[PDB]
């Protein structure tokens, strides 16, 4: 993944407007609704029986905050995504057994959420920049999988 300087600026500028807890809960919720097999990691999270139950689930929201918080922090290191997420890559492979395809699905949902949230401000060039970012983060989180 290689963003141009203007793309990095674009990412940073839009993200400055993001409520990370809110977008994190929304993205993880939509992940579990749109791609319900991803629920397999969250049997301990309680009621996931309907879309409203998933989106409103406080444990879903809490993990959403956690995941997107780490995502957000990683945006400070667009020049070292592999290195920035290496220890989380190890954890997800070694202990959590999370198929890295889950990271790609979440990236796709995140892009949809950003488009929904920002509307026309999420221009085709801004989207392209964010596609590079979510691909790069997913690739970084997948790197340690042996």
């Amino acid at each position: 993944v290689h963003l141009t300087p203007e793309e990095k600026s674009a990412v940073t500028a839009l993200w400055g407007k993001v409520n990370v807890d809110e977008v994190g809960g929304e993205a993880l919720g939509r992940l579990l609704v749109v791609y319900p097999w991803t629920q397999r990691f969250f049997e301990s999270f309680g009621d996931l029986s309907t879309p409203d139950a998933v989106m409103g689930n406080p444990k879903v929201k809490a993990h959403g905050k956690k995941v997107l918080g780490a995502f957000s922090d990683g945006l400070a290191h667009l020049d070292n995504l592999k290195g920035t997420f290496a220890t989380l890559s190890e954890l997800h492979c070694d202990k959590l057994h999370v198929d890295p395809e889950n990271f790609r699905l979440l990236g796709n949902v995140l892009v949809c959420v950003l488009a929904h949230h920002f509307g026309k401000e999420f221009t085709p060039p801004v989207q392209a920049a964010y596609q590079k970012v979510v691909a790069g983060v997913a690739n970084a989180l997948a790197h340690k999988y042996h």
Binding site: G29, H116, F122, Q127, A128, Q131
Partner: protein
């Protein structure tokens, strides 16, 4: 399979698109060319610059095809038969690209339908575009 609720959701959401269908089709294509540049390998004969008549025209054809599919959601294989033929026998676009355009259509819809793009509608639209893609690649081999 597309459930009754999927069909209801798609009809309602695409109904709202209405007269903007062609515009949104063009925007989805532009988003695709920028986000997934390998897809440009299928359009070397196009001016792909922003606002081109070719991309606007093609956007309208893609959008109208989707309107056809929405209108005949109970039997899309027959509704899209000529189009399935065209892609399988002539255009021969690799099936992986249908997911790319579908994601870009979904993003375009999310950006224009703030009220309608709920998690349930999101899911239904994703299923619908995947179903259309399946029909359009059903005759490839």
């Amino acid at each position: 399979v597309l459930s009754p609720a999927d069909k209801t959701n798609v009809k309602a959401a695409w109904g709202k698109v209405g007269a903007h269908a062609g515009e949104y089709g063009a925007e989805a294509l532009e988003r695709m060319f920028l986000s997934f540049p390998t897809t440009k390998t299928y359009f070397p004969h196009f001016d792909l610059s922003h606002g081109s008549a070719q991309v606007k025209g093609h956007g309208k054809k893609v959008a109208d095809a989707l309107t056809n599919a929405v209108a005949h959601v109970d039997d899309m294989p027959n509704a899209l038969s000529a189009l399935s033929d065209l892609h399988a026998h002539k255009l021969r676009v690799d099936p992986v690209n249908f997911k790319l355009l579908s994601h870009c259509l979904l993003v375009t819809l999310a950006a224009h339908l703030p009220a309608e793009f709920t998690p349930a509608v999101h899911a239904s639209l994703d299923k619908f575009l995947a179903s259309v893609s399946t029909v359009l690649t059903s005759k490839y081999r």
